[PDB]
Coordinates of C-alpha atoms and ligand atoms in Angstrom, one line a residue:
Chain N
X1 CA 58.4 -1.0 38.5
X2 CA 57.0 -3.6 36.1
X3 CA 53.4 -3.8 34.8
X4 CA 51.1 -5.5 37.4
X5 CA 49.6 -8.8 36.2
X6 CA 46.0 -7.9 37.3
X7 CA 44.1 -4.7 37.5
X8 CA 44.0 -3.9 41.2
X9 CA 40.2 -3.2 41.2
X10 CA 38.5 -5.6 38.8
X11 CA 41.2 -8.3 38.6
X12 CA 41.3 -8.2 34.8
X13 CA 44.6 -9.5 33.2
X14 CA 46.6 -6.4 32.1
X15 CA 50.2 -7.7 32.3
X16 CA 50.2 -9.1 28.8
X17 CA 49.3 -5.7 27.3
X18 CA 52.2 -3.4 28.1
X19 CA 54.3 -4.3 25.1
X20 CA 51.3 -4.2 22.7
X21 CA 50.3 -0.8 24.3
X22 CA 53.8 0.6 23.5
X23 CA 53.7 -0.9 20.1
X24 CA 50.4 0.8 19.4
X25 CA 51.9 4.1 20.6
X26 CA 54.6 3.6 18.0
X27 CA 51.8 3.2 15.5
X28 CA 50.8 6.8 16.3
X29 CA 47.6 5.9 18.2
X30 CA 46.1 8.3 20.6
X31 CA 46.4 6.7 24.1
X32 CA 42.6 6.3 24.2
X33 CA 42.6 4.5 20.9
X34 CA 45.4 2.2 22.1
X35 CA 43.5 1.3 25.2
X36 CA 40.3 0.7 23.2
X37 CA 42.3 -1.5 20.7
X38 CA 43.4 -3.6 23.7
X39 CA 39.8 -4.0 24.9
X40 CA 40.0 -2.0 28.2
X41 CA 36.6 -0.5 28.8
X42 CA 36.4 0.0 32.6
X43 CA 38.5 3.0 33.6
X44 CA 39.9 0.9 36.4
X45 CA 41.7 -1.2 33.8
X46 CA 42.5 1.9 31.7
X47 CA 44.1 3.5 34.7
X48 CA 46.6 0.7 34.9
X49 CA 48.3 1.1 31.5
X50 CA 47.6 4.8 31.3
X51 CA 49.5 5.6 34.6
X52 CA 52.1 2.8 34.6
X53 CA 55.8 3.7 34.7
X54 CA 58.1 1.0 33.4
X55 CA 61.0 1.6 35.8
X56 CA 62.5 -1.9 35.2
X57 CA 63.9 -0.6 31.9
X58 CA 66.0 1.9 34.0
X59 CA 67.0 -0.9 36.4
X60 CA 68.4 -3.1 33.6
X61 CA 71.1 -0.5 32.8
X62 CA 73.1 -1.6 35.9
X63 CA 75.3 -4.6 35.7
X64 CA 74.0 -7.9 37.1
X65 CA 75.8 -8.8 40.4
Chain Z
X1 CA 52.2 -10.0 62.4
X2 CA 48.8 -10.1 64.0
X3 CA 47.3 -10.7 60.5
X4 CA 45.2 -13.8 60.8
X5 CA 45.8 -16.6 58.3
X6 CA 43.4 -16.1 55.4
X7 CA 42.0 -19.6 55.7
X8 CA 40.3 -18.8 59.1
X9 CA 37.2 -17.4 57.5
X10 CA 35.8 -20.7 55.9
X11 CA 37.7 -23.5 57.9
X12 CA 36.5 -24.9 61.2
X13 CA 39.3 -25.5 63.7
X14 CA 38.9 -28.6 65.8
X15 CA 36.3 -28.5 68.5
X16 CA 34.1 -26.0 66.7
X17 CA 30.5 -26.6 65.7
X18 CA 29.4 -25.4 62.3
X19 CA 25.9 -24.5 63.5
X20 CA 24.5 -24.2 67.1
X21 CA 20.9 -23.7 68.1
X22 CA 19.8 -21.8 71.3
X23 CA 16.3 -21.2 72.5
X24 CA 15.4 -17.5 73.0
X25 CA 13.6 -17.1 76.3
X26 CA 12.4 -13.5 75.7
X27 CA 9.7 -14.5 73.3
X28 CA 8.0 -18.0 72.8
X29 CA 8.9 -20.0 69.7
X30 CA 12.1 -18.1 69.0
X31 CA 15.5 -19.5 68.3
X32 CA 19.0 -18.2 67.5
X33 CA 21.2 -20.1 65.0
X34 CA 24.9 -19.3 65.4
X35 CA 26.7 -20.5 62.3
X36 CA 30.5 -20.4 62.3
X37 CA 32.7 -19.6 59.3
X38 CA 29.9 -18.0 57.3
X39 CA 29.1 -14.5 56.1
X40 CA 26.4 -12.6 54.3
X41 CA 26.5 -15.2 51.5
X42 CA 24.3 -17.6 53.5
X43 CA 22.9 -15.2 56.1
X44 CA 21.2 -12.8 53.6
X45 CA 19.8 -15.6 51.4
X46 CA 18.5 -17.7 54.3
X47 CA 16.9 -14.6 55.9
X48 CA 15.2 -13.7 52.6
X49 CA 13.9 -17.2 52.1
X50 CA 12.6 -17.3 55.7
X51 CA 10.7 -14.1 55.2
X52 CA 8.6 -15.7 52.4
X53 CA 7.2 -18.2 54.9
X54 CA 3.8 -16.9 56.2
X55 CA 4.3 -18.9 59.5
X56 CA 7.5 -16.9 60.2
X57 CA 6.8 -13.9 62.5
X58 CA 10.4 -12.7 62.5
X59 CA 13.5 -13.6 60.6
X60 CA 16.7 -11.6 60.8
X61 CA 20.4 -12.1 60.8
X62 CA 23.6 -10.2 61.9
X63 CA 27.3 -10.5 61.7
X64 CA 28.4 -9.6 65.3
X65 CA 31.8 -8.4 64.0
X66 CA 33.3 -8.3 60.5
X67 CA 36.6 -9.7 61.8
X68 CA 34.8 -12.7 63.4
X69 CA 33.2 -15.3 61.2
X70 CA 29.9 -15.9 63.0
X71 CA 26.5 -15.2 61.7
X72 CA 23.5 -15.2 64.2
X73 CA 20.1 -15.8 62.6
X74 CA 17.1 -15.1 64.9
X75 CA 13.9 -16.9 63.8
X76 CA 10.5 -16.6 65.5
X77 CA 7.5 -18.5 64.1
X78 CA 3.8 -18.9 65.0
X79 CA 3.2 -21.2 68.0
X80 CA 2.4 -24.3 65.8
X81 CA 5.6 -24.4 63.8
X82 CA 9.1 -24.8 65.3
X83 CA 11.8 -22.3 64.1
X84 CA 14.0 -25.3 63.4
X85 CA 11.4 -26.7 61.1
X86 CA 11.2 -23.3 59.3
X87 CA 15.0 -23.2 59.0
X88 CA 15.1 -26.6 57.4
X89 CA 12.3 -25.8 55.1
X90 CA 14.0 -22.6 54.0
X91 CA 17.2 -24.5 53.2
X92 CA 15.4 -27.2 51.2
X93 CA 13.5 -24.5 49.2
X94 CA 16.8 -22.7 48.4
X95 CA 18.4 -26.0 47.3
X96 CA 15.4 -26.8 45.1
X97 CA 15.6 -23.3 43.6
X98 CA 19.3 -23.5 42.9
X99 CA 19.0 -27.0 41.3
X100 CA 16.2 -25.7 39.1
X101 CA 18.3 -22.7 38.2
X102 CA 21.3 -24.9 37.3
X103 CA 19.1 -27.0 35.0
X104 CA 17.6 -23.9 33.3
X105 CA 21.0 -22.3 32.9
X106 CA 22.4 -25.4 31.3
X107 CA 19.5 -25.5 28.9
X108 CA 20.0 -21.8 28.1
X109 CA 23.7 -22.3 27.4
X110 CA 22.9 -25.2 25.0
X111 CA 20.3 -23.1 23.2
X112 CA 22.6 -20.1 22.9
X113 CA 25.5 -22.3 21.7
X114 CA 23.4 -24.0 19.1
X115 CA 21.8 -20.7 18.0
Chain Y
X1 CA 6.3 -20.6 51.8
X2 CA 8.4 -22.2 48.9
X3 CA 11.0 -21.4 46.3
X4 CA 10.6 -19.1 43.4
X5 CA 10.6 -20.5 39.8
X6 CA 13.6 -18.5 38.5
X7 CA 14.1 -18.3 34.7
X8 CA 17.2 -17.6 32.7
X9 CA 17.7 -15.7 29.4
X10 CA 21.2 -15.6 28.0
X11 CA 21.6 -12.4 26.0
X12 CA 25.2 -12.9 25.0
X13 CA 27.9 -15.6 25.3
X14 CA 31.6 -15.2 24.3
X15 CA 34.8 -16.7 25.4
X16 CA 35.5 -13.6 27.6
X17 CA 32.1 -13.0 29.2
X18 CA 28.5 -14.2 29.5
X19 CA 25.6 -11.7 29.8
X20 CA 22.3 -13.0 31.0
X21 CA 19.1 -12.2 33.0
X22 CA 17.5 -14.0 36.0
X23 CA 13.8 -13.3 36.6
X24 CA 11.5 -14.4 39.3
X25 CA 14.0 -14.4 42.1
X26 CA 14.7 -12.6 45.4
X27 CA 17.4 -9.9 45.5
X28 CA 19.2 -11.9 48.2
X29 CA 19.6 -15.0 46.0
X30 CA 20.7 -12.9 43.1
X31 CA 23.3 -11.0 45.2
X32 CA 24.5 -14.3 46.7
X33 CA 25.0 -15.8 43.3
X34 CA 26.9 -12.6 42.3
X35 CA 29.0 -12.9 45.5
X36 CA 29.7 -16.6 44.9
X37 CA 31.0 -15.7 41.4
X38 CA 33.7 -13.7 43.1
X39 CA 34.5 -15.5 46.3
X40 CA 33.5 -19.2 46.1
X41 CA 34.2 -20.6 42.6
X42 CA 37.3 -22.7 43.0
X43 CA 40.1 -22.5 40.4
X44 CA 43.8 -23.4 40.1
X45 CA 46.5 -20.8 40.8
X46 CA 50.2 -20.9 41.8
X47 CA 50.4 -21.1 45.6
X48 CA 53.8 -22.7 46.3
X49 CA 57.0 -21.3 44.8
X50 CA 60.6 -22.6 45.4
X51 CA 63.2 -20.3 43.9
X52 CA 66.3 -22.3 43.2
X53 CA 68.1 -19.3 41.6
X54 CA 67.2 -15.6 41.1
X55 CA 69.4 -13.0 39.6
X56 CA 66.7 -10.6 38.3
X57 CA 66.3 -7.1 39.5
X58 CA 63.1 -8.2 41.3
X59 CA 63.6 -9.8 44.6
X60 CA 62.1 -13.3 45.2
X61 CA 58.8 -12.3 46.9
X62 CA 58.0 -10.1 43.9
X63 CA 58.5 -12.9 41.4
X64 CA 56.4 -15.3 43.6
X65 CA 53.6 -12.8 44.0
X66 CA 53.5 -12.1 40.3
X67 CA 53.5 -15.9 39.6
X68 CA 50.5 -16.3 41.9
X69 CA 48.4 -14.0 39.7
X70 CA 49.1 -15.9 36.5
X71 CA 45.7 -17.4 35.6
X72 CA 45.7 -21.1 34.6
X73 CA 43.3 -23.0 32.4
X74 CA 41.3 -25.0 35.1
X75 CA 38.2 -25.8 33.1
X76 CA 37.5 -29.4 34.0
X77 CA 40.6 -30.5 36.0
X78 CA 39.6 -28.4 39.0
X79 CA 36.5 -30.5 39.8
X80 CA 38.5 -33.7 40.0
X81 CA 41.3 -32.1 42.1
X82 CA 41.1 -31.9 45.9
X83 CA 42.2 -29.2 48.3
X84 CA 45.8 -29.8 49.3
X85 CA 45.1 -29.7 53.1
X86 CA 42.3 -32.2 52.5
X87 CA 44.5 -34.5 50.4
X88 CA 46.2 -37.3 52.3
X89 CA 49.4 -37.1 50.2
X90 CA 52.8 -36.3 51.5
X91 CA 52.3 -32.6 50.8
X92 CA 51.9 -32.7 47.0
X93 CA 50.7 -35.1 44.3
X94 CA 48.9 -35.0 40.9
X95 CA 45.6 -35.4 42.8
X96 CA 46.0 -32.1 44.7
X97 CA 48.4 -29.9 42.7
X98 CA 50.0 -29.3 39.3
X99 CA 53.7 -28.8 39.1
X100 CA 55.4 -26.0 37.1
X101 CA 59.0 -25.5 36.3
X102 CA 60.6 -22.3 35.0
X103 CA 64.3 -22.0 34.0
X104 CA 65.3 -18.9 31.9
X105 CA 69.0 -17.8 31.5
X106 CA 69.4 -14.5 29.7
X107 CA 72.8 -15.2 28.0
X108 CA 72.4 -12.7 25.2
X109 CA 72.9 -8.9 24.6
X110 CA 69.2 -8.2 24.4
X111 CA 66.6 -7.9 27.2
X112 CA 65.0 -11.3 27.6
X113 CA 61.3 -11.1 28.5
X114 CA 60.4 -13.9 30.9
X115 CA 56.7 -14.3 30.0
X116 CA 54.0 -16.9 30.9
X117 CA 55.2 -18.9 27.8
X118 CA 58.2 -20.0 29.8
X119 CA 56.1 -21.5 32.5
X120 CA 56.1 -25.3 31.8
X121 CA 53.5 -27.5 33.5
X122 CA 53.7 -31.3 34.1
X123 CA 50.0 -31.5 33.0
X124 CA 48.9 -30.4 29.5
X125 CA 45.3 -29.4 30.7
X126 CA 46.6 -26.8 33.1
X127 CA 48.6 -24.1 31.2
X128 CA 48.8 -20.4 31.4
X129 CA 45.7 -18.8 29.8
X130 CA 47.7 -16.8 27.3
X131 CA 49.3 -20.1 26.2
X132 CA 50.2 -11.6 23.9
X133 CA 51.7 -13.5 26.9
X134 CA 51.9 -12.3 30.5
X135 CA 55.3 -10.7 31.3
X136 CA 56.7 -12.1 34.6
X137 CA 60.0 -10.3 34.5
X138 CA 62.7 -8.8 32.2
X139 CA 66.3 -10.1 32.4
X140 CA 69.6 -8.5 31.5
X141 CA 72.6 -10.4 30.1
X142 CA 73.9 -12.9 32.6
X143 CA 70.8 -13.0 34.7
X144 CA 69.2 -16.3 35.5
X145 CA 65.7 -17.1 37.0
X146 CA 65.2 -20.7 37.9
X147 CA 62.4 -21.9 40.1
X148 CA 59.8 -24.7 40.5
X149 CA 56.2 -24.1 41.6
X150 CA 53.0 -25.9 42.4
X151 CA 49.4 -24.6 41.7
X152 CA 46.6 -25.9 43.8
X153 CA 42.8 -25.6 44.1
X154 CA 41.4 -22.6 45.9
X155 CA 38.7 -20.0 45.7
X156 CA 38.7 -16.2 45.8
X157 CA 37.6 -15.9 49.4
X158 CA 41.0 -17.1 50.5
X159 CA 43.0 -14.9 48.2
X160 CA 42.2 -12.8 45.1
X161 CA 44.4 -14.9 42.8
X162 CA 41.8 -17.7 42.9
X163 CA 39.1 -15.1 41.8
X164 CA 38.0 -16.3 38.3
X165 CA 36.1 -13.2 37.4
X166 CA 37.5 -10.0 35.9
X167 CA 34.5 -7.8 37.0
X168 CA 30.9 -9.0 37.5
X169 CA 28.4 -6.3 36.3
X170 CA 25.1 -6.7 38.2
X171 CA 22.0 -4.6 37.9
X172 CA 18.3 -4.6 38.6
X173 CA 15.4 -2.1 38.0
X174 CA 17.3 0.0 35.4
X175 CA 14.6 2.6 35.2
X176 CA 14.4 2.9 39.1
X177 CA 10.7 2.0 39.2
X178 CA 11.1 0.8 42.9
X179 CA 13.0 4.0 43.9
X180 CA 15.6 2.0 45.8
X181 CA 17.7 5.0 44.7
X182 CA 16.4 8.6 44.8
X183 CA 17.9 10.9 42.1
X184 CA 17.9 14.5 43.3
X185 CA 17.6 15.5 39.6
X186 CA 16.7 12.4 37.6
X187 CA 17.2 14.3 34.3
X188 CA 21.0 14.3 34.7
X189 CA 21.4 10.5 34.9
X190 CA 22.2 8.5 31.7
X191 CA 20.0 5.6 30.9
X192 CA 21.1 2.1 31.8
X193 CA 21.9 -0.1 28.8
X194 CA 18.8 -2.2 29.9
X195 CA 16.5 0.8 30.2
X196 CA 13.2 0.6 28.3
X197 CA 12.4 4.4 28.6
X198 CA 12.1 6.8 25.8
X199 CA 14.6 9.7 26.0
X200 CA 11.9 12.3 27.0
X201 CA 11.5 10.1 30.1
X202 CA 14.1 10.1 32.9
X203 CA 12.7 7.6 35.4
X204 CA 9.9 5.0 35.4
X205 CA 6.8 5.9 37.4
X206 CA 6.9 4.8 41.0
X207 CA 5.7 1.2 41.7
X208 CA 4.2 0.9 45.2
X209 CA 3.8 -2.9 44.7
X210 CA 7.1 -3.5 43.0
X211 CA 9.7 -6.0 44.1
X212 CA 13.2 -6.5 42.7
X213 CA 13.3 -9.0 39.9
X214 CA 14.9 -9.4 36.5
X215 CA 18.5 -9.1 37.6
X216 CA 20.9 -8.4 34.8
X217 CA 24.3 -10.1 34.9
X218 CA 27.5 -9.7 32.9
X219 CA 30.1 -12.1 34.2
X220 CA 33.6 -11.5 32.6
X221 CA 36.1 -14.3 33.1
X222 CA 39.7 -13.5 33.7
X223 CA 40.5 -16.6 31.6
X224 CA 40.9 -19.5 34.1
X225 CA 37.4 -20.7 33.4
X226 CA 34.8 -20.2 30.7
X227 CA 32.1 -17.8 31.9
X228 CA 29.5 -20.5 31.4
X229 CA 31.7 -22.7 33.7
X230 CA 32.0 -19.9 36.2
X231 CA 28.3 -19.6 36.6
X232 CA 27.6 -23.3 36.7
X233 CA 30.3 -24.0 39.2
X234 CA 29.1 -21.1 41.3
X235 CA 25.5 -22.4 41.5
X236 CA 26.8 -25.9 42.2
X237 CA 29.1 -24.6 45.0
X238 CA 26.3 -22.6 46.6
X239 CA 24.0 -25.6 46.5
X240 CA 26.8 -27.7 48.0
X241 CA 27.2 -25.1 50.9
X242 CA 23.5 -25.1 51.6
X243 CA 23.4 -28.9 51.6
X244 CA 26.3 -29.1 54.0
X245 CA 24.6 -26.7 56.3
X246 CA 21.5 -28.8 56.0
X247 CA 23.5 -31.9 57.1
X248 CA 25.1 -30.1 60.1
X249 CA 21.7 -28.7 61.1
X250 CA 20.1 -32.1 60.9
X251 CA 22.9 -33.4 63.1
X252 CA 22.4 -30.5 65.6
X253 CA 18.7 -31.0 65.8
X254 CA 19.0 -34.7 66.4
Chain X
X1 CA -17.9 -0.9 68.9
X2 CA -14.7 1.0 69.8
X3 CA -14.9 3.8 67.2
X4 CA -13.8 7.0 69.0
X5 CA -14.7 9.3 66.1
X6 CA -16.0 9.1 62.5
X7 CA -16.7 11.7 59.8
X8 CA -16.2 12.5 56.1
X9 CA -13.7 15.3 55.2
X10 CA -12.7 17.2 52.1
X11 CA -9.2 18.5 51.4
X12 CA -8.8 22.3 51.2
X13 CA -4.9 22.3 51.0
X14 CA -2.4 19.6 50.3
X15 CA 0.6 21.6 51.5
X16 CA 0.1 25.4 52.3
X17 CA 3.6 26.1 53.4
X18 CA 5.3 24.3 50.5
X19 CA 6.3 20.6 50.8
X20 CA 9.1 20.0 53.4
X21 CA 9.2 16.2 52.7
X22 CA 9.1 14.4 49.3
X23 CA 6.9 11.5 50.5
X24 CA 4.8 13.1 53.3
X25 CA 2.3 15.8 52.7
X26 CA 0.3 17.9 55.2
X27 CA -3.3 17.7 54.2
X28 CA -5.6 20.4 55.6
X29 CA -9.1 19.1 55.6
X30 CA -12.6 20.3 56.6
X31 CA -15.6 18.3 57.7
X32 CA -19.1 19.0 56.2
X33 CA -21.3 17.1 58.7
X34 CA -19.8 19.0 61.6
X35 CA -17.2 21.8 62.1
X36 CA -14.0 19.8 62.6
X37 CA -10.7 21.1 61.3
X38 CA -8.1 18.4 60.4
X39 CA -4.4 18.6 59.8
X40 CA -2.9 15.2 58.8
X41 CA 0.5 14.1 57.6
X42 CA -0.1 11.4 54.9
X43 CA 2.5 9.3 53.1
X44 CA 1.4 10.4 49.7
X45 CA 3.9 8.1 47.9
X46 CA 1.9 4.9 48.7
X47 CA -1.5 6.7 49.0
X48 CA -1.6 9.7 46.6
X49 CA -4.2 12.3 47.7
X50 CA -5.3 15.2 45.3
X51 CA -6.8 18.5 46.2
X52 CA -10.5 18.5 46.8
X53 CA -10.7 14.8 47.4
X54 CA -13.4 13.5 49.7
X55 CA -12.8 10.7 52.2
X56 CA -14.3 8.9 55.1
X57 CA -12.1 9.1 58.2
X58 CA -12.5 6.9 61.3
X59 CA -10.5 7.1 64.5
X60 CA -10.8 3.8 66.4
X61 CA -9.5 2.3 69.6
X62 CA -9.0 -1.1 68.0
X63 CA -9.4 -2.8 64.6
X64 CA -11.2 -6.1 65.4
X65 CA -14.7 -4.5 65.4
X66 CA -15.5 -6.4 68.7
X67 CA -14.0 -4.1 71.3
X68 CA -11.2 -6.7 71.9
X69 CA -8.0 -4.9 72.6
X70 CA -5.2 -4.9 70.1
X71 CA -2.1 -5.6 72.3
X72 CA -0.1 -3.0 70.4
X73 CA 2.1 -5.7 68.7
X74 CA 2.4 -6.5 65.0
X75 CA 0.6 -9.8 64.3
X76 CA 0.6 -10.4 60.5
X77 CA -0.9 -13.8 61.1
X78 CA -4.0 -12.3 62.8
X79 CA -7.2 -14.1 61.7
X80 CA -9.8 -11.9 63.3
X81 CA -12.2 -9.8 61.2
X82 CA -10.5 -6.3 61.0
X83 CA -12.0 -2.9 60.1
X84 CA -8.9 -2.3 57.9
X85 CA -10.5 -4.4 55.2
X86 CA -13.1 -1.7 54.7
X87 CA -10.5 1.1 54.3
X88 CA -7.5 2.0 52.1
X89 CA -5.1 3.9 54.4
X90 CA -4.6 2.6 57.9
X91 CA -2.1 4.2 60.3
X92 CA -1.6 3.5 64.0
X93 CA -0.5 6.2 66.5
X94 CA -0.8 7.6 70.0
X95 CA -2.7 10.7 71.1
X96 CA -0.1 13.0 72.9
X97 CA -2.0 16.2 73.6
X98 CA -5.6 17.5 74.1
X99 CA -5.8 21.3 74.1
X100 CA -9.0 23.1 74.8
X101 CA -10.5 26.6 75.0
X102 CA -11.4 25.9 78.7
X103 CA -11.1 28.8 81.1
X104 CA -10.3 28.4 84.8
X105 CA -14.0 28.3 85.6
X106 CA -15.7 26.6 82.6
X107 CA -15.3 23.4 80.5
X108 CA -13.8 23.4 77.1
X109 CA -16.2 23.8 74.2
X110 CA -13.6 23.5 71.4
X111 CA -11.0 20.7 71.8
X112 CA -7.9 20.0 69.7
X113 CA -6.6 16.4 69.8
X114 CA -3.0 15.7 68.6
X115 CA -2.0 12.2 67.4
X116 CA 1.4 11.0 66.3
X117 CA 1.4 8.0 63.9
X118 CA 5.1 7.1 64.2
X119 CA 6.0 10.8 63.6
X120 CA 3.2 11.7 61.1
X121 CA 1.3 14.3 63.0
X122 CA -2.4 14.9 63.0
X123 CA -4.4 17.6 64.7
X124 CA -8.2 17.4 65.0
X125 CA -9.9 20.5 66.2
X126 CA -13.6 20.8 66.8
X127 CA -16.5 20.7 69.3
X128 CA -15.7 18.9 72.5
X129 CA -18.8 16.6 72.2
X130 CA -17.2 14.8 69.2
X131 CA -13.8 14.4 70.8
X132 CA -14.6 12.8 74.2
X133 CA -13.4 9.4 73.1
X134 CA -9.9 10.8 73.0
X135 CA -7.6 10.5 76.0
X136 CA -3.8 11.3 76.0
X137 CA -1.3 8.5 75.8
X138 CA -4.0 6.0 74.4
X139 CA -3.1 4.0 71.3
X140 CA -5.4 4.6 68.4
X141 CA -5.9 3.7 64.7
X142 CA -6.6 6.2 61.9
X143 CA -8.5 4.5 59.1
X144 CA -9.2 6.4 55.8
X145 CA -10.9 5.7 52.5
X146 CA -11.4 8.1 49.6
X147 CA -15.0 8.4 48.4
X148 CA -16.1 9.1 44.8
Ligands
ZN301 ZN1 40.2 -3.4 36.0
ZN302 ZN1 47.9 -34.4 47.3

């Protein structure tokens, strides 16, 4: 839906890294390079950004009320 | 809906003793300490400290149920040394250890920060 | 029949983590310290949310749950706070809580990111850690999110949002001299970062008189506390628990 | 006293059938001062034993070298002089079988006493005269010391 604030396993903050992650993908980073650039070593944290689906973008197409 | 409130794992409701001592009649000089609202955090450390006492013949602990926040610590000592005295001595030794470790950790932080 | 003489050697200290080594200690004490790091270091986190107006695509409980996981700088202010239920105030006060207010109206033709920057505290010492910033929600044009909240003192045993650590690496006997673990084929296993073995070796020789000591810690902070502060508050809290148990036991014996 | 048996043995096989446990090895040993065969399961991890090693073996009813009974309970705070101080490897088990070559009309010349130290099995075959101290379901201590 939207990026979780914490990694579910280790509780590292990962909610402030989605936009930067996408920005690094627009910089033609490999996804491993992007996750390394954001300082995500444990694969528990890397799983979060690597497998997230930002469905909220699809939900903001519909009108408000 | 049957989920317990999360605070009933470290909070004593009214009319609950934190710690209760019961003599064990099976063996002389044996006691059971039932401590409420505790877990392996205190049980394992107190058991390990008690095992270092030579006058302690047996020291063990159990959690009777993971969903119930009791720990039962069985202590048996030699017949010149009460299990209650051993328990108090173990806690005092652990407190002294942790205070020493706090002091040395502060010194280590200051040395690492200074360089 | 007495305490060990434990010694500390800090191998690394940053703003994100502290890596250190504790020698001359029982395994139980080291594991209890590792456990207190997670479950018993009190921090400040949002735990009361009143939503005055929500028009976002996310329902109210979603926004509240996300707000709870926002980590807050609680370096020194947490010690002088009290637990709310222990506080005698009429439900809230600056001695047991820190008020937050958020009011964001997306009145523009671009998706407005409601981040942690929009959270405004009544106390300057307790801010969101990132104050890049933690995204709370995204808003379309004509969507308002307006709420107040209060953040209170608690520890990770009650709920994981009060957990200060972002992963506590803990190790001992990196070369497996004690054989607390038995590798079926020790050749296949990579060396620990603390191993002292040359690469032709796969496992230290068995030690019949060995005992676990020299426990390696790497405590990473989520950001609410400095890792130095995490470890110091952990040791202080565990000592406090043991002293309280000492008091109750002395009362029970008497 | 209270020593049911004593001898010196030498190891002729550490494990003839290939090891079946990574910490326990089945020593096959021979006695030179008599003709006693020994099979013995030894926890080699804490007490490594090599092939051809010599050792004194003593099978005793008690440890206190006074004849005082042991009570069969672990007492780490025991202060009495123990025989275990004179030895390196001390196990405690229970004899559970005494076979013999007795016929229906004669007494056994060769006896085979089986002892189980918590699972670690020992057989001691030999002349009956050396094995009269044994008696099934009696607790016993195996003390062992390697000799240069
Ligand atoms: Zn993680
Ligand atoms: Zn208050």
